[PDB]
Amino acid sequence: TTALVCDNGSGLVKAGFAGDDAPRAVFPSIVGRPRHQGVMVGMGQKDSYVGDEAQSKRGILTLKYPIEHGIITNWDDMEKIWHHTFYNELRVAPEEHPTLLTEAPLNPKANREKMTQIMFETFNVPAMYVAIQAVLSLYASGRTTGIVLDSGDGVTHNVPIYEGYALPHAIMRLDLAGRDLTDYLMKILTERGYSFVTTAEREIVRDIKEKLCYVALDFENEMATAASSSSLEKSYELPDGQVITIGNERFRCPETLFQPSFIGMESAGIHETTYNSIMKCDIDIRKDLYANNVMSGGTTMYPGIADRMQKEITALAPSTMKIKIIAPPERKYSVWIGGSILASLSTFQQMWITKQEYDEAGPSIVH
Amino acid sequence: TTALVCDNGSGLVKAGFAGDDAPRAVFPSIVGRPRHQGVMVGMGQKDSYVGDEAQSKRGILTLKYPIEHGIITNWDDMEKIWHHTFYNELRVAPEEHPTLLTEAPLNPKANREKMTQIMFETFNVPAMYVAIQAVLSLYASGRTTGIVLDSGDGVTHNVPIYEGYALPHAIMRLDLAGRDLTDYLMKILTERGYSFVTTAEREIVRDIKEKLCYVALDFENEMATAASSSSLEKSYELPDGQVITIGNERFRCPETLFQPSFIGMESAGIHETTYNSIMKCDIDIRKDLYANNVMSGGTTMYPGIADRMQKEITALAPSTMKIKIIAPPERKYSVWIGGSILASLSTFQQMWITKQEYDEAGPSIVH
Amino acid sequence: TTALVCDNGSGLVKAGFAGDDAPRAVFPSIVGRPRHQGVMVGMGQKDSYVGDEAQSKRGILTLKYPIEHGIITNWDDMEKIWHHTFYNELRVAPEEHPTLLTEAPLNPKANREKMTQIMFETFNVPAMYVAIQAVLSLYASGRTTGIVLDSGDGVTHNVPIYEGYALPHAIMRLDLAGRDLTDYLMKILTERGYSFVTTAEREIVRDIKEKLCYVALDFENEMATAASSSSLEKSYELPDGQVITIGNERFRCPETLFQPSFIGMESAGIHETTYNSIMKCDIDIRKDLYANNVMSGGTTMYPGIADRMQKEITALAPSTMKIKIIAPPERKYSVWIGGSILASLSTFQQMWITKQEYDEAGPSIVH
Ligand SMILES: Nc1ncnc2c1ncn2[C@@H]1O[C@H](COP(=O)(O)OP(=O)(O)O)[C@@H](O)[C@H]1O
Ligand SMILES: Nc1ncnc2c1ncn2[C@@H]1O[C@H](COP(=O)(O)OP(=O)(O)O)[C@@H](O)[C@H]1O
Ligand SMILES: Nc1ncnc2c1ncn2[C@@H]1O[C@H](COP(=O)(O)OP(=O)(O)O)[C@@H](O)[C@H]1O
């Protein structure tokens, strides 16, 4: 009996055993379905396709993301990947040990009950629990105080924490980055005349985001520095072998996190959504936060995200104070790393909710 | 020459002539600005938008409230609505007759000088005066003694009055209700999975507050009475025509006024902030107050606010005494009603401060 | 066996061993409790928090003062700090040596019995005694005659003494200064537009009182001298790093002690509450008092308290007489300094009341 912990963060969903520095199985969550007539009537490949079964064979498939924004749009496709995650991929019996399932802070409650539901009546699990995407970032870093910053594909959220006491009233969540950061790119490639739009090809575009973006670090010149003297085009090769030329939007896609008037849906932006999350915290309590904001987003490995938060918060915020954005490279597994830590440790062991608790009243005890 | 009286209480700002039972122009105070590219290069609608000019066309606009908490955050956007209030809306020349401008009790002084300022050097007014949000509630009710209770969008405050003699040391002001009552709702809708967050949509949410809230009236059962036997969901239609289902939080939003540990910012709560305002009043003087508390808040039409103050003060307070919360339905214009009364009447006529007084020393005579 | 002596004066409560020039442990008396959801289920910090355990971590906590005005409002929270004061902080076994516990002159008797009670049946003490806040000020100064003046946070009181013979009929106690001097400041900061109000932040404000107040020293000009020519604003930095500007109320908060018509609760004021305490003393006996008034208040280090008592009593009082306000800088520990003196000395040794005396009849012998 040992805890297997998994997150729903869309993108690559991530699952592994407790007491480990990295999960065993990391694969993207997608259900593919064939969109064309079956000809080899027998073939030798499945009806529908999950994960890298699907991710390998793309264009022939159409791709559906069950995780939509932390919230899950369809259940029945979703439970497949859980059905898969445990059996194939990492191979584990249904009933061994509890499972910590991380999950988004502000999303609706009807999200996690049916989730706990299908963690019980369909395939029974030895108890269960659901943590918060944020808090596990600290259990990873070993921090106690501090304000996280998450993006991932699922949703962008930050939850300032001080000594294991959350500040719910200060929880700021804007639904952005992730997919919506790529979708803006497929929007903005046609600038260069590459029309990529289909659901299967999206994950070619995502790879372009992966390899070359960075972050503006003061884009004014950076728009000029692109146009005027262009050494910064980085050509790229995509699976057919056709050339690409980019570099005007290499930084312009991640730049949207600092001005979501480019994406067109105006809310805040990630740099000052933390500051406004601080301002709602206490006058005293906020001093240390400026030092401690951990930012494990799972999107943001961007080379120079830190720089432009270091840059931008200083324009905001008390001048006399030392603002420190810690940027652990080991993140992007962090919200999982919290799991294999928080679960494998004890004083949490009684905090699993046994099937008895689901037997007590219902799924409704999660709240 | 006849007095036009106006209040700043954010929400719907309210202005009309003296000697009338209701103001002529009532519109919400917002400056809208277009957030997207102008395409119809000529169109036929203004650069920026105030009030119902803006309130009509929302999602395209971004909305800014110059009144923030009685205190005004930006002046230059603010003076627009005054510039507008007099010219369009109710149409009045700059210089006719003085104007009574109501204003919050405890807010900083730098608030009302520049206000008086721009009531003079930019567009000159035939004198001026600024009353208190509280006191005009009595001039409306015709009461003399009694403790008001105000909420409105601007700020929550109560000022016990006994025979035209205020008790400043007993003035209790907690900054709450109003906007911060709605902002908690947009927080708490996502409970049901409706993510409404944008500045333009907020005033859809505000309408939901408007139509269906009431007040807990003993919420313990009321949380159970919601969950267990649910007949109380009231569905609602919002301008697209999409359905909504509510009723778990219908009473849970106004409930925050009685436990501002739900909003997360802990101060007091409105029921016992009056009692604690009484306790700071005299031992004798307090008997009648328990009978007289008028509560014209401008937010609180809630069906059953009175009940739960009647309920809660009795749990507090001397038992042998008869506590009476009068709940005039004509309120929400009350703090204006005081104006058209106090101004149109006389023995106040010498109390206007003429431009001469502003010419005497400066704006500083208001204190 | 050596006497440990402690005072309840709220503010910083102060305890140390007999025969020393200053107590070992000086910390503020507060019981903090977490007001938000526990998230780090294990953390590593206590259920509830006392003193600097609490004083370090503020905004997350809510703060309760068991000492209210010398009178103690809640016992069970109170006994914690005593439970703490002896064990942690200065570390001492329950039963070693008696303890002198200072305490307010005019407060109710039900105050000190239960106090003596919980000094016995819960944790037994080798006898006990309770002196007066006033008298120990002289045992410190080594004076015999003279009228004290106390403020502290607990209560303001002055007890004229002549050769170890108190004048009870002349004891003047007005409940003021201390907390109620700060609470007036949080009232009067919003003048400048700083809304500080929450229980945890209060002790930021208290620090502002600490560093910059002084005393009017003839405020008429001093209100003008502030307004007209302003060099006297002293900006300040508070734990976030946000700027403050003050100086109109720097002297206006302590000024309330000379006109408690600013605080709104009208009693007397500290300058002429001593003179009226003198007038109730004998015609002969009063000559020397005017020379001897010691004023160890524990609040009043204010730079120029002495000046405005020197100033004000002269306006009162016989002209031909030399009025001398001695202002020992070593005070604010004084009422403790009396303890380590009066206890460590002898001829008081038989005046401890042994558990036998509590065994004789009950706690009731204190009177
Ligand atoms: N090096 C990188 N640079 C930019 N974006 C990245 C990089 N690595 C991953 N991403 C984006 O971040 C996402 C991380 O997804 P995931 O961590 O599962 O979301 P969540 O944080 O909600 O779990 C990926 O889907 C990818 O789109
Ligand atoms: N029937 C109602 N039920 C609940 N809330 C209401 C109702 N009518 C108005 N409100 C809220 O009360 C506010 C009143 O604003 P307003 O009176 O201008 O503030 P002030 O009292 O400071 O002038 C409105 O903005 C609205 O949010
Ligand atoms: N330098 C200072 N200037 C002004 N006020 C002070 C200063 N030092 C302390 N105080 C106030 O005086 C209080 C002293 O509290 P304390 O001496 O415990 O009360 P008591 O005199 O009843 O024991 C402090 O809480 C603080 O508010």
Side-chain angles (χ1 to χ4, degrees), chain A residues 1-39 41-42 44-367, chain B residues 1-39 41-42 44-367, chain C residues 1-39 41-42 44-367:
Chain A
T1 54
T2 187
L4 54 90
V5 296
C6 53
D7 61 349
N8 299 137
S10 66
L12 296 169
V13 297
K14 293 173 290 295
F17 286 152
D20 188 3
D21 63 7
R24 288 187 176 177
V26 175
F27 60 88
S29 68
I30 297 100
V31 175
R33 290 177 178 82
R35 62 188 181 92
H36 298 164
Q37 290 298 321
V39 175
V41 296
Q45 293 177 335
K46 292 196 295 185
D47 295 346
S48 64
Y49 299 130
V50 305
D52 282 342
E53 294 81 352
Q55 188 63 256
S56 65
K57 55 178 74 173
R58 284 184 286 99
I60 180 170
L61 295 178
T62 184
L63 301 178
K64 307 306 287 184
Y65 284 80
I67 306 298
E68 193 280 333
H69 275 141
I71 58 105
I72 67 175
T73 300
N74 185 28
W75 290 86
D76 190 3
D77 60 355
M78 176 62 181
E79 60 184 341
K80 293 185 176 74
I81 71 169
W82 284 342
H83 174 71
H84 290 83
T85 305
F86 300 158
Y87 296 154
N88 53 339
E89 297 93 357
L90 64 84
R91 57 193 65 83
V92 173
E95 188 75 13
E96 66 173 347
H97 196 276
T99 183
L100 173 61
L101 175 56
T102 316
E103 182 275 341
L106 192 61
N107 58 349
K109 299 296 185 179
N111 186 338
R112 54 171 191 181
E113 52 189 342
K114 293 179 67 65
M115 183 174 76
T116 297
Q117 186 72 60
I118 60 174
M119 293 301 181
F120 286 155
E121 82 279 1
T122 180
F123 60 97
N124 298 131
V125 176
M128 186 175 175
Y129 180 75
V130 290
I132 296 170
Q133 300 295 107
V135 298
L136 297 177
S137 298
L138 270 61
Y139 289 84
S141 178
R143 299 295 188 87
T144 180
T145 184
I147 171 173
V148 300
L149 184 147
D150 180 6
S151 64
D153 290 349
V155 64
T156 295
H157 62 79
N158 55 343
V159 178
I161 305 301
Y162 181 84
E163 280 73 351
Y165 292 130
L167 274 67
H169 60 291
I171 293 173
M172 291 295 105
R173 168 182 174 170
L174 54 82
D175 174 55
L176 186 60
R179 187 177 299 103
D180 290 346
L181 178 58
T182 67
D183 289 344
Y184 176 76
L185 186 68
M186 298 193 291
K187 181 75 179 300
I188 199 61
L189 287 178
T190 59
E191 176 67 11
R192 297 295 185 87
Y194 306 134
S195 65
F196 284 166
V197 291
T198 185
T199 183
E201 188 279 342
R202 176 175 292 104
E203 288 76 357
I204 290 172
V205 179
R206 189 183 68 194
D207 292 348
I208 288 99
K209 180 183 78 177
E210 293 298 319
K211 191 180 73 65
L212 50 87
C213 288
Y214 64 85
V215 172
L217 192 149
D218 172 64
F219 72 94
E220 288 302 318
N221 54 28
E222 189 68 18
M223 289 181 181
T225 304
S228 65
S229 175
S230 296
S231 61
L232 56 80
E233 290 83 355
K234 294 177 63 178
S235 63
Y236 174 72
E237 182 280 339
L238 61 77
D240 67 8
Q242 69 184 18
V243 178
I244 300 172
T245 298
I246 302 174
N248 183 25
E249 67 278 5
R250 287 184 62 243
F251 57 86
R252 182 169 61 189
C253 47
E255 167 180 342
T256 193
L257 292 178
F258 300 142
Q259 291 86 357
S261 177
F262 290 99
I263 188 166
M265 65 176 285
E266 179 278 332
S267 178
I270 183 64
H271 63 79
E272 83 288 13
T273 192
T274 58
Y275 176 77
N276 294 136
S277 177
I278 298 301
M279 296 300 292
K280 291 179 177 180
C281 300
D282 302 344
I283 299 301
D284 181 8
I285 206 65
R286 73 177 68 196
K287 172 65 181 296
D288 58 353
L289 290 174
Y290 289 87
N292 302 134
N293 57 346
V294 300
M295 63 164 285
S296 67
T299 63
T300 176
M301 296 297 185
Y302 290 92
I305 180 65
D307 291 347
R308 188 163 171 80
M309 290 180 68
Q310 288 293 326
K311 176 170 177 287
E312 190 65 22
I313 287 175
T314 55
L316 282 64
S319 177
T320 56
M321 169 173 57
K322 179 58 160 57
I323 57 103
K324 186 181 297 296
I325 293 103
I326 67 104
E330 72 281 10
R331 68 185 182 276
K332 180 176 181 177
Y333 301 136
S334 65
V335 67
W336 183 88
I337 297 301
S340 178
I341 291 171
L342 189 148
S344 62
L345 177 141
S346 178
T347 201
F348 169 78
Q349 300 304 321
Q350 73 289 2
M351 187 65 180
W352 300 104
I353 57 106
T354 63
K355 175 60 165 59
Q356 193 67 54
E357 281 78 357
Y358 180 79
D359 291 340
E360 294 295 320
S364 300
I365 196 64
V366 294
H367 302 159
Chain B
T1 54
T2 187
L4 54 90
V5 296
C6 53
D7 61 349
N8 299 137
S10 66
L12 296 169
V13 297
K14 293 173 290 295
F17 286 152
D20 188 3
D21 63 7
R24 288 187 176 177
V26 175
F27 60 87
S29 68
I30 297 100
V31 175
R33 290 177 178 82
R35 62 188 181 92
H36 298 164
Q37 290 298 321
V39 175
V41 295
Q45 293 177 335
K46 292 196 295 185
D47 295 346
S48 64
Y49 299 130
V50 305
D52 282 341
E53 294 81 352
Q55 188 63 256
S56 65
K57 55 179 74 173
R58 284 184 286 99
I60 180 170
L61 295 178
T62 184
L63 301 178
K64 307 306 287 184
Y65 284 80
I67 306 298
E68 193 280 334
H69 275 141
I71 58 105
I72 67 175
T73 300
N74 185 27
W75 290 85
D76 190 3
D77 60 355
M78 176 62 181
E79 60 184 341
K80 293 185 176 74
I81 71 169
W82 284 342
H83 174 71
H84 290 83
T85 305
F86 300 158
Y87 296 154
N88 53 339
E89 297 93 357
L90 64 84
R91 57 193 65 83
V92 173
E95 188 75 13
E96 66 173 347
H97 196 276
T99 183
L100 173 61
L101 175 56
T102 316
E103 182 275 341
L106 192 61
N107 58 349
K109 299 296 185 179
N111 186 338
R112 54 171 191 181
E113 52 189 342
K114 293 179 67 65
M115 183 174 76
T116 297
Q117 186 72 60
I118 60 174
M119 293 301 181
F120 286 155
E121 82 279 1
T122 180
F123 60 97
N124 298 131
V125 175
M128 186 175 175
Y129 180 75
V130 290
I132 296 170
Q133 300 295 107
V135 298
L136 297 177
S137 298
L138 270 61
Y139 289 84
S141 178
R143 299 295 188 87
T144 180
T145 184
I147 171 173
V148 300
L149 184 147
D150 180 6
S151 64
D153 290 349
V155 64
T156 295
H157 62 79
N158 55 343
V159 178
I161 305 301
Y162 181 84
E163 280 73 351
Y165 292 130
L167 274 67
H169 60 291
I171 293 173
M172 291 295 105
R173 168 182 174 170
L174 54 82
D175 174 55
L176 186 60
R179 187 177 299 103
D180 290 346
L181 178 58
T182 67
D183 289 344
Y184 176 76
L185 186 67
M186 298 193 291
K187 181 75 179 299
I188 199 61
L189 287 178
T190 59
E191 176 67 11
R192 297 295 185 87
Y194 306 134
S195 65
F196 284 166
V197 291
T198 185
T199 183
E201 188 279 342
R202 176 175 292 104
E203 288 76 357
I204 290 172
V205 179
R206 189 183 68 194
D207 292 348
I208 288 99
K209 180 183 78 177
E210 293 298 319
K211 191 180 73 65
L212 50 87
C213 288
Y214 64 85
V215 171
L217 192 149
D218 172 64
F219 72 94
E220 288 302 318
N221 54 28
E222 189 68 18
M223 289 181 181
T225 304
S228 65
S229 174
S230 296
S231 61
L232 57 80
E233 290 83 355
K234 294 177 63 178
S235 63
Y236 174 72
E237 182 280 339
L238 61 77
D240 67 8
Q242 69 184 18
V243 178
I244 300 172
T245 298
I246 302 174
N248 183 25
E249 67 278 5
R250 287 184 62 243
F251 57 86
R252 182 169 61 189
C253 47
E255 167 180 342
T256 193
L257 292 178
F258 300 142
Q259 291 86 357
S261 177
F262 290 99
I263 188 166
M265 65 176 285
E266 179 278 332
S267 178
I270 183 64
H271 63 79
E272 83 288 13
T273 192
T274 58
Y275 176 77
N276 294 136
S277 177
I278 298 301
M279 297 300 292
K280 291 179 177 180
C281 300
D282 302 344
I283 299 301
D284 181 8
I285 206 65
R286 73 178 68 196
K287 172 65 181 296
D288 58 353
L289 290 174
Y290 289 87
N292 302 134
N293 57 346
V294 300
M295 63 164 285
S296 67
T299 63
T300 176
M301 296 297 185
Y302 290 92
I305 180 65
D307 291 347
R308 188 163 171 80
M309 290 181 68
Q310 288 293 326
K311 176 170 177 287
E312 190 65 22
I313 287 175
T314 55
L316 282 64
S319 177
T320 56
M321 169 173 57
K322 179 58 160 57
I323 57 103
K324 186 181 297 296
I325 293 103
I326 67 104
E330 72 281 10
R331 68 185 182 276
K332 180 176 181 177
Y333 301 136
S334 65
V335 67
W336 183 88
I337 297 301
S340 178
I341 291 171
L342 190 148
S344 62
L345 177 141
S346 178
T347 201
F348 169 78
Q349 300 304 322
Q350 72 289 2
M351 187 65 180
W352 300 104
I353 57 106
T354 63
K355 175 60 165 59
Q356 193 67 54
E357 281 78 357
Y358 180 79
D359 291 340
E360 294 295 320
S364 300
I365 196 64
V366 294
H367 302 159
Chain C
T1 54
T2 187
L4 54 90
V5 296
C6 53
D7 61 349
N8 299 137
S10 66
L12 296 169
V13 297
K14 293 173 290 295
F17 286 152
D20 188 3
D21 63 7
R24 288 187 176 177
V26 175
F27 60 88
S29 68
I30 297 99
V31 175
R33 290 177 178 82
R35 62 189 181 92
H36 298 164
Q37 290 298 321
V39 175
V41 296
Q45 293 177 335
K46 292 196 295 185
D47 295 346
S48 64
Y49 299 130
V50 305
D52 282 341
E53 294 81 352
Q55 188 63 256
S56 65
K57 55 179 74 173
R58 285 184 286 99
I60 180 170
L61 295 178
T62 184
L63 301 178
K64 307 306 287 184
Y65 284 80
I67 306 298
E68 193 280 334
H69 275 141
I71 58 105
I72 67 175
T73 300
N74 185 27
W75 290 85
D76 191 3
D77 60 355
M78 176 62 181
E79 60 184 341
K80 293 185 176 74
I81 71 169
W82 284 342
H83 174 71
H84 290 83
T85 305
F86 300 158
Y87 297 154
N88 53 339
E89 297 93 357
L90 64 84
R91 57 193 65 83
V92 173
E95 188 75 13
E96 66 173 347
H97 196 276
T99 183
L100 173 61
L101 175 56
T102 316
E103 182 275 341
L106 192 60
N107 58 349
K109 299 296 185 179
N111 186 338
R112 54 171 191 181
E113 52 189 342
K114 293 179 67 65
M115 183 174 76
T116 297
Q117 186 72 60
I118 60 174
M119 293 301 181
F120 286 155
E121 82 279 1
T122 180
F123 60 97
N124 298 131
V125 176
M128 186 175 175
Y129 180 75
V130 290
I132 296 170
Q133 300 295 107
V135 298
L136 297 177
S137 298
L138 270 61
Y139 289 84
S141 178
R143 299 295 188 87
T144 180
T145 184
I147 171 173
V148 300
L149 184 147
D150 180 6
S151 64
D153 290 349
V155 64
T156 295
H157 62 79
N158 55 343
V159 178
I161 305 302
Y162 181 84
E163 280 73 351
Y165 292 130
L167 274 67
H169 60 291
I171 293 173
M172 291 295 105
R173 168 182 174 170
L174 54 82
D175 174 55
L176 186 60
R179 187 177 299 103
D180 290 346
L181 178 58
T182 67
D183 289 344
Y184 176 76
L185 187 68
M186 298 193 291
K187 181 75 179 300
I188 199 61
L189 287 178
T190 59
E191 176 67 11
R192 297 295 185 87
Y194 306 134
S195 65
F196 284 166
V197 291
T198 185
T199 183
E201 188 279 342
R202 176 175 292 104
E203 288 76 357
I204 290 173
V205 179
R206 189 183 68 194
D207 292 348
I208 288 99
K209 180 183 78 177
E210 293 298 319
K211 191 180 73 65
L212 50 87
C213 288
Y214 64 85
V215 172
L217 192 149
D218 172 64
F219 72 94
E220 288 302 318
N221 54 28
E222 189 68 18
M223 289 181 181
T225 304
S228 65
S229 175
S230 296
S231 61
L232 56 80
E233 290 84 355
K234 294 177 63 178
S235 63
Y236 174 72
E237 182 280 339
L238 62 77
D240 67 8
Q242 69 184 18
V243 178
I244 300 172
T245 298
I246 302 174
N248 183 25
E249 67 278 5
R250 287 184 62 243
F251 57 86
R252 183 169 61 189
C253 47
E255 167 180 342
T256 193
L257 292 178
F258 300 142
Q259 291 86 357
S261 177
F262 290 99
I263 188 166
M265 65 176 285
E266 179 278 332
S267 178
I270 183 64
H271 63 79
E272 83 288 14
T273 192
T274 58
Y275 176 77
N276 294 136
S277 177
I278 298 301
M279 297 300 292
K280 291 179 177 180
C281 300
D282 302 344
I283 300 301
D284 181 8
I285 206 65
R286 73 177 68 196
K287 172 65 181 296
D288 58 353
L289 290 174
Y290 289 87
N292 302 134
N293 57 346
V294 300
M295 63 164 285
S296 67
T299 63
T300 176
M301 296 297 185
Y302 290 92
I305 180 65
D307 291 347
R308 188 163 171 80
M309 290 181 68
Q310 288 293 326
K311 176 170 177 287
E312 190 65 22
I313 287 175
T314 55
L316 282 64
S319 177
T320 56
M321 169 173 57
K322 179 58 160 57
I323 57 103
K324 186 181 297 296
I325 293 103
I326 67 103
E330 72 281 10
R331 68 185 182 276
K332 180 176 181 177
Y333 301 136
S334 65
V335 67
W336 183 88
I337 297 301
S340 178
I341 291 171
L342 190 148
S344 62
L345 177 141
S346 178
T347 201
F348 169 78
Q349 300 304 322
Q350 73 289 2
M351 187 65 180
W352 300 104
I353 57 106
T354 63
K355 175 60 165 59
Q356 193 67 54
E357 281 78 357
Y358 180 79
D359 291 340
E360 294 295 320
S364 300
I365 196 64
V366 294
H367 302 159

